[PDB]
């Protein structure tokens, strides 16, 4: 039942900008999300001090997907463990404890890709989090789908738009509520020529070209969040990427980079079934 939102697909209601996504299948400069617009959005929360660490996504009732740099990043002496964090699901407001709406969960085990490259380019920036006890779904809590080879093949094309959400910085003030932005996928060549960093097959970049007029991007605080796309074949939402890295936010001639989820699905499958 993944990818079908209780307040939208299930009632046959379209959200305010999904049409932009569908019409393309031929957070900075974003906007407030609608209630129940991204029921898989998860907030990585630090106990002490109490603070927003990153975004993440709900892929089942027991598993959360995020960027490995949110948990381990030696250059900044960052190396969190299960007991240092809290996962908050069902949120809209960034700072308010949404009583009766959100659910807070504890972690049982963190799994970081064994080949995550924090030394150079955040290659394989991905991590899975096993919650202690299953979260119950509701109108505001529902998992996103992981893509299969076919879906990945037909959707991950330059020009096709995806959607990014998060409570991170609005400029390079934090938002009051969850922000949302739709961005086009960019050609590898262009991604490669916009930076000095070595780009691998495990990444993809998104954002508007400087001449495209429209703009927008992820920013600090957004890390680990999902880049999703709506399949025009079965109407479900699939997570194609994980907000990973950028050099600035919404810089002209620059683009945000994302972890290519499909390329790493074998590791994801492996873990989930080997550890429940």
């Amino acid at each position: 039942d993944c990818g079908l939102r209780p307040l939208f697909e299930k009632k046959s209601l379209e959200d305010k900008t999904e049409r932009e996504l569908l019409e393309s299948y031929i957070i900075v400069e974003g906007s407030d999300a609608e209630i129940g617009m991204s029921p898989w959005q998860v907030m990585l929360f630090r106990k002490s001090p109490q603070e927003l660490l990153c975004g993440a996504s709900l892929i089942s009732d027991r598993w959360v997907l995020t960027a490995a740099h949110c948990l381990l990043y030696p250059p900044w002496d960052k190396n969190f463990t299960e007991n240092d964090l809290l996962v908050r699901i069902g949120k809209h407001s960034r700072t308010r404890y949404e009583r009766n709406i959100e659910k807070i969960s504890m972690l049982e085990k963190i799994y970081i890709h064994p080949r995550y490259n924090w030394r150079e380019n955040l290659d394989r920036d991905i991590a899975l989090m096993k919650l202690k006890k299953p979260v119950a779904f509701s109108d505001y809590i529902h998992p996103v789908c992981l893509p299969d080879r076919e879906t990945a093949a037909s959707l991950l094309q330059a020009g096709y738009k995806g959607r990014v959400t998060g409570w991170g910085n609005l400029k390079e003030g934090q938002p009051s509520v969850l922000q949302v932005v739709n961005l086009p996928i960019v050609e590898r060549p262009v991604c490669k020529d916009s930076t000095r960093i070595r780009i691998t097959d495990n990444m993809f970049c998104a954002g508007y070209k400087p001449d495209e007029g429209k703009r927008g991007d992820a920013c600090e605080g957004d890390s680990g969040g999902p880049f999703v796309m709506k399949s025009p074949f079965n109407n479900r939402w699939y997570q194609m990427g994980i907000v990973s890295w950028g050099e600035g936010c919404d810089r002209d001639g620059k683009y945000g980079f994302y972890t290519h989820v499909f390329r790493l699905k074998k590791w994801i499958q492996k873990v989930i079934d080997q550890f429940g």
């Binding site: 109490q50 603070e51 700072t95 308010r96 807070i104």
Partner: peptide
């Protein structure tokens, strides 16, 4: 500016 969450989760 985070609102205090219930201690039951902090434990």
């Amino acid at each position: 500016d985070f609102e205090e969450i219930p201690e039951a989760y902090l434990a």
